[PDB]
DNA sequence: GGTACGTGATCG
DNA sequence: CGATCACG
């Protein structure tokens, strides 16, 4: 007796928390309320007698004192050992951060546990509730906005000039200037356009609102303009406004009762691109071109009133492709949510490490296993500093016909068979153990470890799904089950990396090294078997390898490689599996996770080399693209070296246009809060002194001028740069922009920074 | 309702 | 050098 859980949160009523579970039941929105769930933490005491002193600990919050409501002695498992801890109950979840350190402080408290779990996620776990279960069909709406922007303006100065939305009914634009198009709704003002978006969202009542970077652009901007205009945005199903949440240094927006699905973090994790522009992303997924209308063109069309039909078509397409992309990427996010038992909102905005931790926390509750704590700043830094033990340095030069092989589906099987877990590492009075090669870590065989045990169930569940897929005549369940087995593969293949994740609860350096040591025996086997087949291995890392058959035909390399994977998988026991990732026409390798390739369709794929960001000048970005194109598209490293020598000489002779020398960097604080004054801050302070309203979010465009001292004293605001009066710093653009951009790439061919000038 | 991550440039 | 700051 349940529908599909889409989210969960809590509200406070008479100072007491009420859990809200948002559900979709046979097409209808339902909200369930729970007033009975209580927040709690665990305390490990030196002796049971101490509970009388410990239960009397107090804190303060909201003018009122905070108390431990009730105490309960519980028997749990910690570090693969029985443990007795006290469950300390509180009235409100905001009581936990107020009292937890007062409890930890106590002389009779050995340690505290499970004290930083958000209340609604604590509820989902403890109540055994899993989001996104069932065949419930959700509704979707893509939303986008276009704003009037001028160089280096304060966030929200310019009005919103268009709002676009799309669904299965089509893509529409709301604007407040006359545009004669079938999909354009013309209203009287920015205020009436924002009120129309509110009306469209309330009427369509979508379960999912899809945006492209709506967390940082569309919704913060809508909220800023709504504030300036004195209007509300009752977008929540409870009529609440979209809520900005601070995630890192960037934002995350939640719309209560709905799933705000921002594609930007999703696409950034899923696919590898030098830029994540909507146009680049759409082309990568659907193989279709999308036209861009730049901010300066939008401003010119709006202010002049000429060429506005072009701007409205761009706004309409932004919503249309946002809808198509959302429908493409949501199914996998929905199955990952269900698998880890947390809402899509949170899961779509998480790293795989955090997905593993949410899976582990729920599994720990189900297995009565006390969860280890997250490290403190000291421990987190020490983990970042730790050195692991075990591949080779890449082959130099430009290689043709490159085959890509993936090793990742090897590691879950190694964790399971060798019982690699923090609870099985170096156990006292162990009867039988596995010793890791080289590294020598001992893993107890006496009981299955917490992680190996879960992994085995994950892998068995995936095999059952795959078996149901072969035996199914229904194409609808085959589709759903395919996303489910893919979600398990993604989660299982994230465990190896998680053991080494410095913020992990079940962090285990020895576990990660041991998996690396056992894994290496299979990587050495793959390498040897490839090499006896005539293959040259050009690059090897724990993730995979790149190989070619020097001087062979491309179809021969493919055929032999495909035959090779088929053969190795037949020799490797169990679920240990090698995967043929792909083929590349050309490629070069600099170091670990620093390489560049080109496929047979002419698409360039790189890792850890490209500088397509606003804080790098166009001259450096343009030169680097030209160097990569000379190498990968022309197969000519001599051309790439000549490109760099020409650009640097042209910079020396002041032959490069100043527009290609601009650096852009955002102001993120009040100017007095800066500890180190970088060039953009030095420029910003001068603007503020002139009367400019400098605020966090303002992007500073500057050019570095010739002179003595650090660059900060020699940087000028772009609007103040006069080509007649000012002279840019050619040495800075050569040595700090152009050469660093290309020196890593060209190192793969034997050139040093010094070889790239006349 | 806890506030990302890895990585590289520049300051102090 | 270590610290500080920004990108996407
Ligand atoms: Mg747009
Ligand atoms: Mg939430």
């Amino acid at each position: 007796h349940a529908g599909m859980i889409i989210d969960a949160d809590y509200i406070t009523e008479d100072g007491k928390p009420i859990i809200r579970i948002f559900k979709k039941e046979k097409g209808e929105f339902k909200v369930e309320y729970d007033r009975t769930f209580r927040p709690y933490i665990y305390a490990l005491l030196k002796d049971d007698s101490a509970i009388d002193e410990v239960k009397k600990i107090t804190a303060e919050r909201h003018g009122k004192i905070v108390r431990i409501t009730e105490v309960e002695k519980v028997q749990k498992k910690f570090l693969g050992r029985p443990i007795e801890v006290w469950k300390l109950y509180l009235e409100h979840p905001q009581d936990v951060p107020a009292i937890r350190e007062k409890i930890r402080e106590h002389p009779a408290v050995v340690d505290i546990f499970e004290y930083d779990i958000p209340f609604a996620k604590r509820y989902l776990i403890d109540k055994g509730l899993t989001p996104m279960e069932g065949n419930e069909e959700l509704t979707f709406l893509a939303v986008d906005i276009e704003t009037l922007y001028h160089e280096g303006e304060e966030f929200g100065k310019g009005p919103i000039i268009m709002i676009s939305y799309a669904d299965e009914e089509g893509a529409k634009v709301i604007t407040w200037k006359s545009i004669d198009l079938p999909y354009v709704e013309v209203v009287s003002s920015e205020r009436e356009m924002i009120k129309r978006l509110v009306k469209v969202i309330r009427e369509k009542d979508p379960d999912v609102i899809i945006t492209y970077n709506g967390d940082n652009f569309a919704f913060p901007y809508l909220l800023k303009r709504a504030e300036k205009l004195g209007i509300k945005l009752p977008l929540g199903r409870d009529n609440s406004e979209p809520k900005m949440q601070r995630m890192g240094d960037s934002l995350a927006v939640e719309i209560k009762g709905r799933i705000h699905f921002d594609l930007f973090p999703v696409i950034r994790r899923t696919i590898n691109l030098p830029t994540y522009t909507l146009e680049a992303v759409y082309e990568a997924i659907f193989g279709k071109s999308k036209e861009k209308v730049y901010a300066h063109e939008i401003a010119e069309a709006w202010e002049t009133g000429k060429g506005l039909e072009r701007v409205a078509k761009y706004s309409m397409e932004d919503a249309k492709v946002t809808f198509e992309l959302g429908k493409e990427f949501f199914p996998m996010e929905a199955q990952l949510a269900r698998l880890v038992g947390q809402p899509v909102w949170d899961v779509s905005r998480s790293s795989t490490g955090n997905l593993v931790e949410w899976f582990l926390l729920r599994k720990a509750y189900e297995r009565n296993e006390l969860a280890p704590n997250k490290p403190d700043e000291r421990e987190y830094e020490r983990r970042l500093r730790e050195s692991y033990e075990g591949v080779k340095e890449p082959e130099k030069g430009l290689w043709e016909g490159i085959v890509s092989l993936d090793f990742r589906s090897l590691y879950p099987s190694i964790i399971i068979t060798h019982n690699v877990s923090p609870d099985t590492l170096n156990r006292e009075n162990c009867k039988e153990y596995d010793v890791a090669p080289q590294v020598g870590h001992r893993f107890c065989k006496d009981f299955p470890g917490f992680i190996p045990s879960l992994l085995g169930n994950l892998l068995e569940e995936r095999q059952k799904i795959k078996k149901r897929m072969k035996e199914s005549k229904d194409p609808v369940e085959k589709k759903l089950l395919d996303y489910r087995q893919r979600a398990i593969k993604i989660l299982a293949n994230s465990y190896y990396g998680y053991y080494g994740y410095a913020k992990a609860r079940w962090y285990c350096k020895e576990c990660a090294e041991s998996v690396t040591a056992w894994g290496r025996q299979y990587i050495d086997l793959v390498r040897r078997e490839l090499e006896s087949r005539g293959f040259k291995v050009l690059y090897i890392d724990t993730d995979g390898l790149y190989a070619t058959i020097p001087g062979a035909k491309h179809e021969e390399i493919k055929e032999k490689a495909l035959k090779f994977v088929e053969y190795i998988n037949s020799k490797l026991p169990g679920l240990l599996e090698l995967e043929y990732e792909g083929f590349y026409a050309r490629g070069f390798f600099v170091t670990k996770k620093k390489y560049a390739l080109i496929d047979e369709e002419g698409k360039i794929v790189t890792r850890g080399l490209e500088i397509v960001r606003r804080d790098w000048s166009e001259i450096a970005k343009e030169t680097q693209a030209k160097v990569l194109e000379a190498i990968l598209k022309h197969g000519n490293v001599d051309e790439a070296v000549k490109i760099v020598k020409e650009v640097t000489e042209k910079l020396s002779k002041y032959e490069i246009p100043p527009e290609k020398l601009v650096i852009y960097e955002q102001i993120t604080r009040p100017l007095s809060e800066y500890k180190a004054i970088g060039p953009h801050v030095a420029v910003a302070k001068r603007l503020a002194a002139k009367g400019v309203k400098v605020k966090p979010g303002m992007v500073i465009g500057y050019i570095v001028l010739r002179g003595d001292g650090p660059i900060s004293k020699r940087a000028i605001a772009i609007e103040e740069f006069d080509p007649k009066k000012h002279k840019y710093d050619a040495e800075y653009y050569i040595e700090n922009q152009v050469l660093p951009a290309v020196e890593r790439i060209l190192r793969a061919f034997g050139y040093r920074k010094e070889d790239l000038k006349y």
Side-chain angles (χ1 to χ4, degrees), chain A residues 2-25 27-63 65-245 247-248 250-299 301-305 307-373 375-376 379-384 386-391 393-466 468-472 474-478 480-602 604-689 691-705 707 709-723 725-743 745-758:
Chain A
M4 188 181 84
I5 297 169
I6 55 161
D7 199 21
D9 86 356
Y10 82 87
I11 59 129
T12 309
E13 198 176 279
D14 193 29
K16 290 167 192 146
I18 329 292
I19 284 285
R20 298 194 294 190
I21 304 103
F22 304 109
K23 279 179 149 183
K24 258 306 254 242
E25 198 169 302
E28 206 201 281
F29 175 67
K30 299 204 181 186
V31 56
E32 285 174 9
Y33 302 99
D34 195 345
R35 306 169 102 97
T36 74
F37 195 68
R38 284 126 65 226
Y40 66 85
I41 72 160
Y42 296 105
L44 173 66
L45 311 179
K46 291 178 80 61
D47 193 283
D48 278 340
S49 60
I51 192 61
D52 301 319
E53 279 305 288
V54 172
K55 71 181 71 189
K56 285 179 200 173
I57 295 176
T58 287
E60 285 180 44
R61 179 184 64 80
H62 201 97
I65 65 112
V66 169
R67 309 181 176 274
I68 294 153
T69 291
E70 181 197 313
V71 300
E72 189 186 335
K73 198 200 185 15
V74 295
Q75 167 65 237
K76 306 189 73 66
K77 274 177 290 160
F78 192 59
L79 287 151
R81 282 173 282 254
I83 203 180
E84 287 152 53
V85 294
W86 290 81
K87 189 172 188 176
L88 276 21
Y89 288 102
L90 292 140
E91 196 173 87
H92 200 278
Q94 288 287 294
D95 288 353
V96 171
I99 202 158
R100 68 188 173 204
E101 292 312 314
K102 296 238 176 65
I103 301 159
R104 186 179 243 137
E105 269 165 19
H106 202 261
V109 175
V110 174
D111 204 343
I112 53 160
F113 304 89
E114 302 184 25
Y115 49 79
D116 47 8
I117 322 278
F119 195 48
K121 308 213 184 161
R122 182 81 275 176
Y123 184 87
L124 290 180
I125 291 164
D126 292 24
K127 293 289 184 180
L129 304 174
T130 296
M132 307 307 284
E133 253 165 6
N135 47 26
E136 192 62 49
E137 287 314 308
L138 292 185
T139 58
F140 299 74
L141 181 71
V143 170
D144 189 34
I145 68 159
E146 297 318 307
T147 68
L148 181 57
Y149 179 81
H150 295 95
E151 292 305 350
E153 265 183 345
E154 51 169 295
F155 186 84
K157 200 243 171 77
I160 298 168
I161 61 160
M162 286 168 197
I163 293 166
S164 52
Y165 61 95
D167 62 15
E168 300 281 4
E169 284 186 349
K172 307 271 165 284
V173 171
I174 323 142
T175 187
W176 53 272
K177 274 189 187 203
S178 191
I179 306 167
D180 190 25
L181 289 163
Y183 50 87
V184 175
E185 193 174 356
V186 175
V187 293
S188 52
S189 57
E190 181 190 19
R191 187 185 301 249
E192 286 313 313
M193 174 197 59
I194 290 172
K195 284 195 175 188
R196 182 55 179 132
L197 176 62
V198 176
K199 190 187 151 167
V200 161
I201 291 169
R202 290 174 69 80
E203 282 181 333
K204 288 179 170 294
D205 190 17
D207 300 307
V208 187
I209 297 171
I210 315 152
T211 66
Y212 196 79
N213 197 29
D215 279 340
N216 302 284
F217 174 61
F219 287 121
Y221 213 100
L222 276 162
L223 277 159
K224 198 92 221 76
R225 298 302 302 176
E227 198 174 300
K228 196 212 169 274
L229 269 45
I231 62 197
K232 294 293 202 143
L233 294 162
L235 298 190
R237 290 219 249 226
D238 62 341
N239 304 313
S240 56
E241 286 196 280
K243 200 181 173 200
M244 272 155 68
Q245 304 293 98
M247 275 211 184
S250 64
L251 300 157
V253 170
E254 44 178 74
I255 292 158
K256 298 176 201 85
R258 305 182 207 277
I259 305 169
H260 170 222
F261 187 70
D262 186 338
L263 287 166
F264 199 64
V266 179
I267 294 160
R268 277 218 270 147
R269 297 190 310 270
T270 316
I271 72 168
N272 178 32
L273 291 181
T275 44
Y276 292 94
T277 58
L278 193 46
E279 294 68 46
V281 166
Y282 176 73
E283 189 170 322
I285 295 319
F286 300 107
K288 285 176 216 168
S289 281
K290 188 195 185 294
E291 199 190 304
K292 222 264 173 178
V293 177
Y294 290 99
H296 65 291
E297 307 174 77
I298 295 165
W302 191 259
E303 293 173 318
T304 311
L308 275 170
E309 293 186 352
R310 207 193 141 228
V311 182
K313 193 184 151 205
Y314 168 78
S315 180
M316 180 274 291
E317 286 191 354
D318 271 357
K320 187 171 183 101
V321 307
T322 293
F323 187 66
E324 295 167 11
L325 284 159
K327 287 293 273 169
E328 178 74 12
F329 282 91
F330 187 89
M332 260 304 312
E333 292 312 308
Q335 290 314 302
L336 276 166
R338 181 205 195 260
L339 181 58
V340 304
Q342 291 301 326
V344 165
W345 191 89
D346 299 272
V347 164
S348 66
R349 288 170 177 82
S350 296
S351 62
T352 55
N354 218 9
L355 286 206
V356 176
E357 207 154 274
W358 279 120
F359 185 82
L360 290 185
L361 280 160
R362 175 173 297 268
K363 283 296 147 154
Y365 188 83
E366 293 174 13
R367 279 152 67 107
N368 189 29
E369 295 225 27
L370 186 63
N373 293 308
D376 47 33
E379 181 57 34
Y380 170 72
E381 282 155 47
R382 191 205 62 94
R383 289 173 181 194
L384 290 169
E386 273 176 321
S387 67
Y388 292 84
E389 191 38 56
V391 202
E393 220 60 76
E395 288 283 342
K396 301 261 177 183
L398 182 59
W399 295 94
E400 294 209 339
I402 305 166
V403 69
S404 183
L405 300 186
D406 185 332
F407 302 150
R408 292 144 161 185
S409 292
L410 167 64
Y411 302 103
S413 307
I414 281 148
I415 293 155
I416 297 160
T417 67
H418 293 293
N419 213 35
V420 181
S421 197
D423 46 305
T424 61
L425 171 70
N426 302 325
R427 280 269 135 167
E428 277 290 290
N429 296 297
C430 187
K431 285 189 180 202
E432 300 180 87
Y433 48 81
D434 269 10
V435 190
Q438 313 304 105
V439 57
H441 299 309
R442 298 176 181 199
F443 300 92
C444 205
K445 293 178 135 297
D446 294 2
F447 56 94
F450 174 67
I451 308 284
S453 159
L454 299 187
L455 255 185
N457 292 337
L458 276 172
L459 299 200
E460 191 34 54
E461 184 48 31
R462 187 168 177 244
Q463 293 302 300
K464 287 176 182 172
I465 289 164
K466 285 191 155 193
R468 286 187 46 192
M469 282 179 72
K470 279 153 199 174
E471 308 168 318
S472 184
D474 177 22
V476 162
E477 70 164 292
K478 288 181 88 158
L480 186 259
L481 295 166
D482 186 54
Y483 293 127
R484 277 187 183 178
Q485 65 85 14
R486 282 181 54 205
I488 291 165
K489 184 184 177 171
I490 287 160
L491 182 71
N493 284 14
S494 312
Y495 275 75
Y496 174 39
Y498 172 88
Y499 274 144
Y501 169 49
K503 266 209 74 225
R505 291 177 183 262
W506 286 269
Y507 172 85
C508 181
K509 177 259 205 174
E510 305 91 339
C511 294
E513 294 189 307
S514 296
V515 172
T516 301
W518 274 300
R520 192 97 161 82
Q521 313 168 293
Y522 289 115
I523 292 167
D524 291 348
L525 174 71
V526 171
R527 183 185 178 241
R528 275 199 304 280
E529 281 293 276
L530 274 174
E531 282 172 338
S532 68
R533 278 157 163 88
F535 283 92
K536 183 153 178 70
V537 174
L538 321 164
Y539 178 97
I540 331 173
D541 81 334
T542 63
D543 283 310
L545 67 79
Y546 296 89
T548 188
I549 297 165
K553 293 191 250 169
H554 287 182
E555 291 299 291
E556 193 192 311
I557 301 176
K558 291 178 195 165
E559 195 205 322
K560 282 185 188 180
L562 279 151
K563 222 187 191 193
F564 170 72
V565 176
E566 171 260 320
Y567 166 77
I568 189 55
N569 287 335
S570 294
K571 278 210 85 206
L572 303 169
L575 306 172
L576 301 166
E577 192 186 56
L578 186 72
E579 204 142 47
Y580 175 95
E581 198 194 67
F583 189 84
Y584 302 88
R586 291 171 177 145
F588 67 88
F589 315 89
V590 178
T591 41
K592 176 204 170 74
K593 300 288 210 185
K594 284 168 156 36
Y595 53 77
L597 278 81
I598 189 174
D599 68 0
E600 295 174 306
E601 299 297 307
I604 294 157
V605 171
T606 67
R607 258 107 178 184
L609 291 172
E610 292 187 85
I611 53 137
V612 193
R613 28 193 282 181
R614 54 163 153 116
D615 57 349
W616 280 88
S617 61
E618 186 44 34
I619 194 62
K621 291 184 291 202
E622 181 202 280
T623 308
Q624 192 198 65
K626 284 180 169 195
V627 163
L628 284 175
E629 279 167 314
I631 295 159
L632 298 173
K633 293 189 178 291
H634 303 157
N636 209 319
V637 59
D638 190 33
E639 190 202 329
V641 177
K642 286 184 236 270
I643 278 155
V644 184
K645 287 184 176 161
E646 271 153 43
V647 174
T648 63
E649 204 185 39
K650 278 175 171 174
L651 281 162
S652 299
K653 291 189 192 296
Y654 295 86
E655 286 181 41
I656 293 304
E659 44 266 34
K660 291 204 195 158
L661 310 172
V662 182
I663 315 294
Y664 290 99
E665 289 183 283
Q666 190 195 175
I667 296 304
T668 61
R669 298 158 187 66
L671 292 176
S672 60
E673 276 191 22
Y674 282 98
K675 305 189 207 80
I677 313 301
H680 81 292
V681 181
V683 166
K685 284 192 177 187
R686 262 181 260 131
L687 291 173
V692 178
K693 291 196 266 206
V694 182
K695 297 158 178 222
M698 187 168 310
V699 171
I700 304 299
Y702 65 91
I703 290 169
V704 182
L705 299 186
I711 64 158
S712 43
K713 317 281 178 72
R714 319 191 266 111
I716 190 168
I718 55 165
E719 291 202 347
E720 290 172 16
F721 182 93
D722 176 22
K725 198 185 160 176
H726 310 108
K727 282 282 169 297
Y728 67 77
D729 188 5
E731 260 288 285
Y732 173 80
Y733 282 96
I734 291 157
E735 299 302 319
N736 296 76
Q737 293 291 305
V738 178
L739 294 183
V742 303
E743 70 158 320
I745 290 153
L746 297 170
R747 261 199 291 278
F749 307 96
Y751 301 92
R752 302 184 297 258
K753 255 219 195 75
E754 319 113 65
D755 298 280
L756 317 176
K757 298 173 264 178
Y758 293 112

